[PDB]
């Protein structure tokens, strides 16, 4: 039919809803739409970062979020053949509160939606699939979406906050400056052994594969086996049995779980892709932000916090434009002009870290020892601060501080 | 006053092997030494696969094994009590190769008993040489005191690293390296351990080296920086015992009866190289008097003995030709230059792993771990242990 | 102000500028090349080249003509660690063809191109002509304003204006261009000394020493030029300590230089070079405008890639302009194809240069392990791929046949 709004946003994920929550708080009619029927449709992680704690306390939101179901992870350890080689406590990085946490996204997103539904100028729809852009007069006017249990949404600003797989990246002719994919992860969950804590963050450098252990919702532990691009098809050929013999040789504590495994149906494959669009704001009334604009690898648990920080900067930029009645393409490029420095700093670190997961004949046996040497450098704590903490709060107007 | 044709000053490994190899050749050979017996001063017990190679070329391997010795098949390196490097010396070459715990006196005496059968061989004890009869630019012999002006065509010095003939001769030290120590002590073999072990440990406080000794007994050398032992003595023995016992918990029994440092022997790991081994006509320097090395790899005894073989071959060649001049003696340094210089350069690279600096001490175990995983470490193993080709000497020097 | 009318306008008569002019002149397009200097000998811009340069020359039937000039081939590069060699590389194994580093100087090569080009009547080159501004009309950049000296003021017009000045570019800011990246972390200190007796002449050597890192290259006239690597801002402190202290440390590292340093009693001999790397965001931004060369994609002086990398951009630029003229399509969309094709190699090189510049650290504990890490990396089973990517080009540049002499 026909709809009217001030700001149109595609997707209600961490970045989309944080932007929608804030923009409504500034007294602008917002619309946020998503295709899934709820927040539980797709699994999208549970771990967070110290940088996330900093952001919430910046807006006076930690107490509200901290009242949810979460488990504070106090440190990260790295092993090599079952012997610890590196330890890092997150509270020695910044004076204020600092810690990782296990906070599932649907828990976090429901907390944001509940706070946002208090405002009457915030509107969220679901099962709403954007399918086209209403670009007219050169500028962008809005989007065309089909709703489920056909409508045109016209707005002054359109923001694309879909995920890696972005439809809004192609309708607006955006171009990628980077396309990295060299590794996989193979995730499975198993019952916590009696000798193990629960709020752990453990990485193992073993003989055959590399393992990452994180807490899972419900007293379980989720493991991830690091593999190369295309090596999983070969693994399945050799059979499940040979996979078990090599895993149990690595981590014998997993003996009890693998007694009841007879197929590759308990494992889930994840592809570690990194991306970067060339120019996020390219057309009038158009912008791109989030993980459709600058994804990163699974290391350090930076993906969600980095996306949320981009939205917060986008809200301040948009707020300045609306008050000044200046929404030209010139004002939109401030998001990239302010986020670029910290997003590219993060991505270059992810490229360095991904070089330690090599499975090559001679490099596989020295990666653990290179890691052990690097972490003993006198100025390694600066890298820790860059990866986990943020030096200064995002400079945005006080109007965004919740009371 | 006694005349001879060859005068060797010192009867160590290098000196004796030169003397025997010349007495068998029908020359008048006299060997001088100062100690009252071969047992007075400790001079090591371990050997390397090059040592077996030298014997089998000389066809004396069977005779040597007839005397007492133990076999040490591999060498292992650990880090915080986990093995990081392993090597078997029998895979380095097709021929049979091993380390031997053959103590020196049971080797020197075996050389003496075999050597004295020849009537032109002569040996003396307590004959401390004092001056050289350097006359007309050449050595007429040596002046000594017994407890003698012995004139010879060649006067070869095998005194050792603490050489007294490095000053009588006007030799110049091309190198002098000294930046580490060792602290030796012997204790009883633990039940869980074996006897024929060659074990090196990278630990938190100190690095240790375990070797066999005395039969059912083990010796351990604690690596310390130069000038650092004088501090452990100033800070008391109680501190030292606790630090060792934390690092190496299986020493708890031996240290329960230790109350002082009088049982600890300080070995100074020195390395040296002479600018020109034979600078004047009539005398030459060979062995550890000229090209000593560090204790790593047990390459010292073989290096000095192999050079004595080179000296004997050249000396016999010169005698057969009757052309014994300055350029003749230089043939020894010309032919041993490649091995002696490559071996020392390796000893300098390994010594760099014994750093005790605040942050380097914790990276050195990791570097060693990486270096052993390189695509070509086995060529370095051969360089350190086995000789690629047999020493080129005429067939007359072999024993049937 | 007197007027001039041409078809293609280029600013600067360095390697990239001159090369592009020659290739455009051969096609029948009127070409004007402008330089501010008296001649090609005014500024000093190095004397070394790369196997990539040989590949580019012979692709256009030019190796023989260049080989006529005076040049000494360099067969290999060595890297030492305390007077001990830790790496060796002969350029002949990189590709099946003939590959090598020469030491041809720039004013020699530039004259070789100049004389060849001026045979075409459509080629014109001016000295002492300095560009001042950009003549933009009707939402386009048509021509420039230049002031000539031995005359007066000139007003050049063309369908295309190309920016081929150096890193210190005026066209960079006259047409407002944006630097995506800029990097500066090190300095080099160059001085020339008489070749010692034992050292050869056609050497390309690098030393990891106790105090400083030394690079030794050949110089014109049987001399040797040496560059000492220093951190940014460390040279001011070095001068404060004194010349006598600086000499003491250098002789410790390289005692072979003792004979040369007797006549050194100040810092007048030394020359300071700043290792700067750049990348222009959008090489083409205004209609009838472009940017190429070190004013676009400068790089650090490691691997001697800078001169050849610019000529690669000029060659692709000549194909870009050629296709537009034959198609009546000199819009911004066609012009942007220059970066769309050059972008890949330029950024691959810039990344390799930042990795290499990490080995020159002078930090208290890092500088003592960099020589050891270099030795570990070069012994990896897959190092030849890096060598091939740093010196040789896998394939020839896909330019038409008309550009072959
Ligand atoms: C398996 C997995 C595990 C992860 N684990 C972690 C972790 O532990 N920690 C962490 O920090 N990050 C993690 N991430 C990354 C995390 O998902 C991102 O950081 C975050 O989701 C980015 O926020 P966003 O706004 O882009 O959300 P999005 O996920 O992009 O939200 C939009 C959603 O809508 C979907 N969509 C696509 N097209 C449309 C359309 N036309 N209309 C509506 N919706 C559409 C998208 O696919 C997406 O699911 C994980 C990701 C994956 C895939
Ligand atoms: C404490 C110690 C432990 C060692 N342990 C080992 C080991 O385990 N394995 C190994 O392979 N190598 C070991 N070595 C090295 C070994 O000593 C040499 O390889 C070997 O001694 C070299 O032989 P040489 O005859 O040149 O020197 P040496 O034989 O050692 O030199 C000393 C000899 O010269 C004689 N002498 C000294 N001064 C005079 C003089 N003025 N006149 C006459 N004769 C004189 C002495 O009586 C003595 O016989 C050790 C060395 C030392 C110091
Ligand atoms: C000290 C030094 C040493 C070097 N050594 C080497 C080496 O060994 N190997 C190598 O491959 N590369 C070397 N280079 C880099 C080399 O100079 C470049 O690769 C090459 O010059 C780039 O070509 P270009 O077309 O940009 O030439 P340019 O040098 O850019 O040619 C244009 C010239 O005109 C000047 N100019 C500035 N403004 C104007 C104007 N308005 N009008 C006219 N002219 C103007 C520029 O400063 C420049 O000198 C060196 C550079 C320096 C500074
Ligand atoms: C020394 C300066 C220049 C020397 C004279 C010029 C001579 C030219 C020829 C020399 C060729 C260089 C060979 C060095 C090998 C090298 O750099 O390998 C590297 C491989 O090793 C790496 O990935 C290392 C990346 C950065 C290394 C940091 C420097 C190491 C030492 C510095 C201080 C110590 C800090 C680090 C602590 C511990 C490190 C683990 C290149 O990797 P890449 O990913 O950039 O490229 C690989 C592929 O081509 C595409 O990705
Ligand atoms: C390993 C996967 C995840 C591990 C645990 C997950 C989460 C925990 C967080 C732990 C933090 C990880 C930090 C690791 C340390 C690290 O990256 O150090 C790096 C080491 O510094 C480097 O430049 C080294 C580059 C990485 C080397 C390549 C990887 C080595 C692995 C095997 C290949 C063998 C190549 C042979 C040697 C190459 C020459 C060095 C610092 O990053 P940087 O590039 O910014 O360095 C600049 C400067 O030189 C300082 O060194
Ligand atoms: C450690 C005391 C004794 C140990 C056991 C005794 C008996 C057994 C013998 C053990 C075999 C020796 C191991 C091999 C290691 C070794 O020296 O080989 C290495 C081979 O390693 C390589 O090629 C990689 C180069 C870098 C690896 C480290 C080797 C040298 C390191 C020096 C200092 C190490 C301390 C680290 C801390 C200091 C900095 C923070 C070098 O020998 P090289 O002759 O090739 O020298 C040339 C140049 O140095 C580069 O190659
Ligand atoms: O569950 C997950 C998946 C990927 C990364 C991470 O930190 N956690
Ligand atoms: O006691 C010693 C001395 C030197 C070498 C070695 O193996 N043992
Ligand atoms: O003299 C020069 C200057 C820059 C780079 C290089 O290789 N040589």
How many helices (H) and strands (E) in chain C?
14, 16
Q: Which atom of ligand 9 is nearest to the CA of C47?
A: 1
Other beta carbons within 10 Å of A270: 14
> Could you identify the residue written with the tokens 């945005």?
A396
Distance between CA B233 and CA B231 in Å, rounded? Answer: 5
- Looking at A254, A272, A290, which one is the last position of a domain? A272
Q: Where are the beta strands (DSSP E) in C232-389?
A: 271-280, 289-291
Query: Quick one: which atom of ligand 4 is closest to the CA of A373?
Result: 38
Query: Preceding residues of all breaks in chain B (C to N beyond 2.5 angstroms)?
Result: 147
Identify whether B368 is part of a domain.
no
Shortest Cα distance, chain B CAs vs residue C94, angstroms: 22
Rounded to the nearest angstrom, the distance between the alpha carbon of C262 and the centre of ligand 9 is 25
Select from A212, A220, A225 the residue to mutate for testing ligand 7; criterion: most ligand atoms less than 8 Å from CB.
A212
For residue B321, what are its two tokens? 């030709």
Ramachandran region of residue C247, left (φ > 0), alpha (ψ -120 to 50) or beta? alpha
Q: How far apart are CA C285 and CA C333, in angstroms?
A: 10
Cβ neighbour number for residue C197 with a 10 Å cutoff: 6
Judging contacts by C-beta atoms under 8 Å, the chain B residues touching residue A83 are: 80, 82
Domain boundary, last residue among A239, A272, A305: A272
* First-to-final CA distance of chain B: 36
Q: How many CB atoms lie within 10 A of CB B256?
A: 10
Phi, psi dihedrals of residue C306, rounded to the nearest 5°? -65, -45
Domain assignment present for B186: no
Are residues A265 and A282 located together in one domain of the fold? Answer: no
Tokens of B132: 């050289």
Distance CA A62, CA A379 (A): 31
Strands A30-34 and A122-126: parallel
Beta partners for residue B86, in sequence order: B76
State how far the Cα of C8 lies from the Cα of C154, in Å rounded to an integer. Answer: 16
Q: Which of B363, B11, B17 is nearest to B202 (CA)?
A: B363
The pair of structure tokens assigned to C297 is 């994609």
- C102, C106, C111, C112 alpha-carbon torsion, rounded to 10°: 20
Locate the DSSP E strands across C140-264: 141-148, 152-157, 160-163, 179-194, 205-208, 213-219, 223-231
CA–CA separation, C317 vs C306, rounded Å?
A: 17
Which residue in C401, B325, B82, C48 sits closest to A369, CA to CA? B82
Please tell me whether residues A123 and A149 are part of one structural domain: yes
* Beta bridge mates, A130: A145
Whole-number Å distance between alpha carbons of B163 and A126: 93
Q: How many CB atoms lie within 10 A of CB B350?
A: 14
Decide if C14 is inside a domain: yes
State the sign of the Cα–Cα–Cα–Cα dihedral C208, C209, C213, C214. Answer: negative
CB B34 within 8 A of CB B127: yes
B46 lines ligand 8 (CB under 6 A): yes
Q: Do B375 and C376 touch (CB under 8 A)?
A: no
Cα separation, B218 vs B354, in Å, equals 22
Compute how many other C-beta atoms are within 10 angstroms of the C-beta atom of residue C145.
Answer: 14
Report the interhelical angle of B378-385 vs B326-351 (nearest 10°). 130
Spell out which chain B residues touch chain A, with contact meaning CB-CB distance below 8 angstroms: 80, 82, 359, 362-363, 366-367, 369-370, 373-375
**How would you label B267-293 residue by residue, b for 16+ Cβ within 10 Å and e otherwise?**
eebbbbbbeebbbbbbbbbbbbbbbbb
B370: which chain C residues are within 8 Å (Cβ-Cβ)? 376
Closest Cα to atom 42, ligand 6: which residue? B349
| Same domain for A144 and A24 | yes
Burial B110-140 (b: 16+ CB within 10 A, else e): bbbeebeebebbbbbeebebeebbbeeebbb
Contacts of C388 (CB under 8 A, 6+ apart): C94, C95, C394
Q: And the tokens for C230?
A: 């220093």
Q: How far apart are the CA of A278 and the nearest CA of chain C, in angstroms? A: 10
The answer to whether the beta carbons of residues A199 and A72 sit under 8 Å apart is yes
Strand pairing report for C2-5 and B208-213: unpaired
Three-class SS state of A225 = strand
| Pocket lining: A314 vs ligand 1, CB cutoff 6 Å | no
Burial class from Cβ neighbours inside 10 Å (0-12, 13-18, 19+) for residue A341 reads: exposed
Residue B255: Cβ-neighbour burial (10 angstroms; 0-12, 13-18, 19+): middle
The DSSP 8-state label assigned to residue A92 in this structure reads: G
Query: Does the CB atom of residue A307 touch ligand 1 within 6 A?
Result: yes
Check: CB of residue B388 under 8 Å from CB of residue B339: no
Please enumerate in sequence order all residues whose Cβ is within 8 A of that of A2, keeping only pairs 6 or more positions apart, or say none.
Answer: A151, A152, A154
B82 part of a folded domain: no
* Residues C145, C134: Cα–Cα separation, whole Å: 6
CA dist., res. A130 & res. C15, Å (int): 52
| Number of the ligand 5 atom closest to the C-alpha atom of A358 | 32
| Partner-chain contact B374 C379, CB within 8 Å | yes
Contacts of B373 in chain A (CB under 8 A): 362, 365-366
Answer left, alpha or beta for residue A127, where phi above 0 means left and psi between -120 and 50 means alpha. Answer: left
Work out whether the CA dihedral A318, A323, A329, A333 comes out positive or negative: negative
Q: Does residue C310 have its Cβ closer than 6 Å to ligand 3?
A: yes
Looking at the fold, whether A57 and A161 belong to one and the same domain comes out as: yes
| Cα-based distances in Å from B207 to A378, B213, B227 | 23, 19, 17
Strands A7-10 and A157-160: parallel
Protein residue with least CA distance to atom 40, ligand 5:
C373
Interatomic CA distance for residues A356 and C132, integer angstroms = 52
Distance CA C320, CA A135 (A): 32
Nearest-CA residue for ligand 5 atom 35 is C377
Nearest CA to ligand 6 atom 11: B381
Tokens at residue B308, please? 């004595």
Say how far apart CA B105 and CA B38 lie, in whole Å.
6
Which residues sit opposite A71 in a β-bridge? A102
Q: Are A241 and A264 within one domain?
A: yes
Of B122, B140, B124, the C-alpha closest to B132 is B140
Q: How far apart are CA B332 and CA C191, in angstroms?
A: 43
CA distance A368 to A371: 5
CATH number at residue A143: 3.50.50.60
Q: List the single residue in B82, B359, B373 with the smallest CB-CB distance to A378.
A: B359
Tell me how far the alpha carbon of residue B357 lies from the centroid of ligand 3, in angstroms: 46
Report yes or no on B308 lying in a domain: yes
| Cβ of B306 below 6 Å from ligand 2 | no
C-alpha torsion angle, residues B156, B158, B162, B167 (rounded to 10): 0
Residue C239 has a CB neighbour count (10 Å cut-off) of: 12
Classify each residue of B309-337 as buried b or exposed e, where b means 16 or more C-beta atoms within 10 Å of its C-beta. bbbbbbbbebbeeeebeeebbbbbbebbe
The CA-based dihedral angle spanning residues C301, C302, C305, C310, taken in that order and rounded to the nearest 10 degrees: -30
Residue A257 DSSP one-character state: G
Measured CA angle at A295 (ends A292, A300), to 5 deg: 150
Q: Please say whether the beta carbons of A49 and A349 come within 8 A.
A: no
Give the domain extent around C312. 2-180+276-403
- Burial string for C77-88 (b: 16+ CB within 10 Å, else e) reads bbbbbeeeebbe
Strands C85-90 and C123-126: unpaired
Q: Looking at the structure, tell me whether residues A42 and A185 fall in a common domain.
A: no
Handedness of CA A321, A327, A331, A333 (dihedral sign): positive
Q: How far apart are CA C246 and CA C267, in angstroms?
A: 10
Q: Say how far apart CA B362 and CA B79 lie, in whole Å.
A: 11
Check residue A47 and report its DSSP letter: B
The answer to whether residues B157 and B289 touch, using CB atoms and an 8 Å cutoff, is: yes
From edge to edge, which strands make up the β-sheet containing B128-135?
A: B2-3, B149-151, B138-145, B128-135
Q: Radius of gyration (Cα) for chain A, nearest Å?
A: 22
Cα(B125)–Cα(B116) distance, integer angstroms: 14
Give the separation between CA C247 and CA C257, rounded to whole angstroms. 10
| Chain B hits for A369, Cβ within 8 Å | 366, 369-370
Strand partners, A212: A203, A224
The answer to whether A255 touches A127, Cβ cutoff 8 Å, is no
Mutate to test the pocket of ligand 3, among C41, C162, C307, C353 (most ligand atoms within 8 A of CB): C307
Residue B21, H or E segment: helix B13-23
Residue nearest to atom 25 of ligand 2 (CA): B12
Contact B359 C368 (CB under 8 A): no
Same domain, A50 and A199: no
Q: Any idea what DSSP says for residue C364? A: T
Residues with Cβ within 8 Å of residue A100, at least 6 apart in sequence: A47, A48, A49, A50, A72, A73, A74, A76, A90, A201, A301
Rounded distance between C-alpha atoms, residue C322 and residue C342, angstroms: 16
- Measured between beta carbons, which residues in chain C are less than 8 angstroms from residue A378? 363-365
Q: Which of B210, B250, B219, B248 is nearest to B80 (CA)?
A: B248
Supply the DSSP string of B70-132, one letter for each residue.
Answer: -EE-EEEEEETTEEEEEEETTSSSSS---EE---SHHHHHHHHHHHHTSTTEEE-SS-EEEEE
Residues A163 and A141 in one domain: yes
Claim to verify: residue A223 and residue A265 sit in the same structural domain: yes
Alpha-carbon distance of A154 to A135, in angstroms, equals 10
Looking at the fold, whether A37 and A57 belong to one and the same domain comes out as yes
Cα A212 to middle of ligand 6, angstroms: 32
Residue B156 bridge partners (DSSP): B8, B284
Q: What is the side-by-side strand order in the sheet with A30-34?
A: A122-126, A30-34, A7-10, A157-160, A287-288
Q: How far is the CA of A37 from the centre of ligand 9 (A)?
A: 63
Breaks (C-N over 2.5 A) in chain C follow: 150
Same domain, A331 and A301: yes
Residue B77 CB–ligand 6 contact under 6 Å: yes
Q: What are phi and psi of C216, to 5 degrees?
A: -120, 125
Query: Does any domain span residue B20?
Result: yes
Ligand 8 centroid distance, CA of B223 (Å): 12
Based on the domain organization, do A232 and A362 belong to the same domain? no
To the nearest whole Å, the CA of B229 is away from the closest chain C CA by: 26
A145: Cα separation from own chain's centroid: 26
Option in B82, B369, B375 nearest A369 (CB): B369
**Number of independent structural domains in chain C:** 1
Q: Report chain B residues whose CB lies below 8 A from the CB of C84.
A: 345
Give the burial class of C185: count Cβ atoms within 10 A of its Cβ; 0-12 exposed, 13-18 middle, 19 or more buried.
middle
CA A345 – CA A387 distance, rounded (Å)? 9
Environment class of C275 (CB within 10 Å of its CB; exposed 0-12, middle 13-18, buried 19+): buried
Gaps (C–N > 2.5 Å) in chain A: which residues precede them? 149
Return the DSSP state at B170.
T
- Pairing mode of beta strands B217-225, B173-188: antiparallel
Contact A20, A124 (CB under 8 A): yes
Q: Which of B269, B305, B271 is nearest to B174 (CA)?
A: B271
CB contact under 8 A, C368 and B360: yes
The residue to which tokens 């930042």 are assigned: C354
Question: How is residue A86 written in tokens?
Answer: 């590196």
Torsion sign, CA atoms A271, A276, A281, A283: negative
Nearest CA to ligand 1 atom 35: A162
CA A234 and chain centroid, separation: 29
Residues of A engaging B, defined by a Cβ cutoff of 8 Å:
81, 83, 362, 365-366, 369-370, 372-373, 376, 378
H-helix or E-strand spanning residue B7: strand B6-9
Q: How far is the CA of C44 from the centre of ligand 3 (A)?
A: 8
Chain B: closest CA distance from residue C131 (Å) = 57
**Residue closest to B142 by CA, chosen among B126, B128, B163:** B128
Q: Beta-strand (E) ranges in C236-327?
A: 271-280, 289-291
Tell me the C-alpha distance between C84 and C371, whole Å: 11
The answer to whether residue B109 is domain-embedded is yes
Residue C31, classed as helix, strand or coil, is strand
Closest C-alpha among A12, A54, A55, A57 to residue A31: A12
Proximal ligand: closest to the CA of A47: 1
Burial label, B246 (beta-carbon count in 10 A; 0-12, 13-18, 19+):
exposed
3-state secondary structure A345-395: HHHHHHHHHHHHHCCCCCCCCCHHHHHHHHCCCCCCHHHHHHHHCCCCCCC
Pocket test for ligand 1, best of A22, A34, A41, A44 (most atoms within 8 A of CB): A44
Cβ of A45 less than 6 Å from ligand 1: yes
Tokens of A394: 């995002």
Q: Can you tell me the distance from the alpha carbon of A65 to that of A301, in angstroms, rounded to the nearest whole number?
A: 18
Residues of C in contact with B374 (CB under 8 A): 376, 379
Residue B263 lies in a domain: no
Tell me which of A272, A304, A330 is where a domain ends. Answer: A272
C365 closest CB neighbour out of A363, A366, A378: A378
Q: Are A122 and A24 in contact (CB under 8 A)?
A: yes
Query: For this experimental structure, what is the resolution in angstroms?
Result: 2.8
**Alpha-carbon gap, residue C379 to B372, rounded angstroms:** 13
Residues A118, A121, A122, A128: is their CA dihedral positive or negative? positive
Burial class for B7, CB neighbours closer than 10 Å (0-12, 13-18, 19+): buried
Report the Cα–Cα distance between both ends of chain C, in Å, rounded.
38
DSSP-H helix ranges across A149-302: 168-171, 231-238, 240-250
Distance CA B10, CA A392 (A): 76
Identify the experimental approach.
cryo-EM
Compute the distance between CA of residue B109 and CA of residue B105 in angstroms, rounded to an integer: 6
């Amino acid at each position: 039919k026909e709809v009217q709004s001030d700001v149109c946003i595609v997707g209600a994920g961490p970045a989309g809803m944080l932007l929608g929550l804030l923009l409504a708080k500034q007294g602008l009619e917002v619309i946020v739409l998503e295709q899934n029927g709820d927040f539980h449709r797709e699994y999208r992680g549970e771990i967070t970062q110290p940088r996330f704690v900093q952001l919430m306390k910046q807006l006076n939101l930690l107490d509200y979020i901290e009242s949810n179901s979460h488990v504070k992870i106090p440190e990260v350890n790295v092993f090599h053949n079952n012997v610890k080689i590196m330890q890092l406590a997150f509270n020695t990085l910044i004076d204020e509160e600092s810690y990782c946490a296990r906070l599932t996204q649907p828990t976090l997103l429901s907390a944001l939606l509940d706070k946002a539904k208090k405002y009457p100028n915030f509107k969220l729809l679901f099962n709403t699939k954007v399918r086209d852009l209403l670009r007219e007069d050169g500028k962008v006017t809005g989007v065309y979406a089909v709703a489920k249990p056909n409508l045109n949404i016209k707005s002054r600003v359109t923001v694309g906050v879909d995920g890696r797989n972005s439809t809004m990246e192609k309708l607006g002719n955006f171009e990628l400056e980077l396309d990295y994919y060299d590794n996989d992860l193979l995730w499975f969950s198993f019952e916590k052994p009696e000798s193990w804590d629960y709020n752990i963050y453990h990485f193992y450098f073993q003989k055959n594969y590399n393992y990452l252990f994180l807490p899972k919702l419900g007293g379980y532990i989720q493991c991830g086996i690091s593999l190369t691009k295309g090596e999983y098809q070969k693994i399945k050929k050799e059979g499940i049995e040979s996979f078990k013999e090599k895993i149990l040789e690595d981590m014998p504590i997993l003996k009890q779980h693998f007694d009841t495994v007879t197929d590759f149906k308990s494992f889930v494959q994840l592809l570690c892709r990194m991306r970067y669009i060339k120019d996020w704001a390219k057309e009038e009334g158009c912008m791109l932000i989030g993980d459709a604009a600058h994804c990163v690898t699974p290391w350090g648990a930076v993906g969600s916090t980095l996306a949320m920080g981009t939205a917060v900067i986008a809200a301040d930029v948009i707020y300045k434009g609306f008050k000044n009645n200046d929404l030209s393409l010139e004002t939109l490029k401030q998001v990239q002009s302010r986020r670029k420095e910290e997003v590219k700093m993060i991505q270059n670190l992810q490229l360095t870290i991904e070089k330690f997961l090599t499975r090559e004949p001679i490099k596989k046996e020295i990666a653990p020892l290179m890691f052990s040497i690097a972490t003993k450098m006198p100025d390694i704590t600066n890298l820790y601060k860059k990866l986990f903490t943020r030096e200064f709060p995002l400079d945005i107007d006080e109007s965004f501080i919740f009371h």
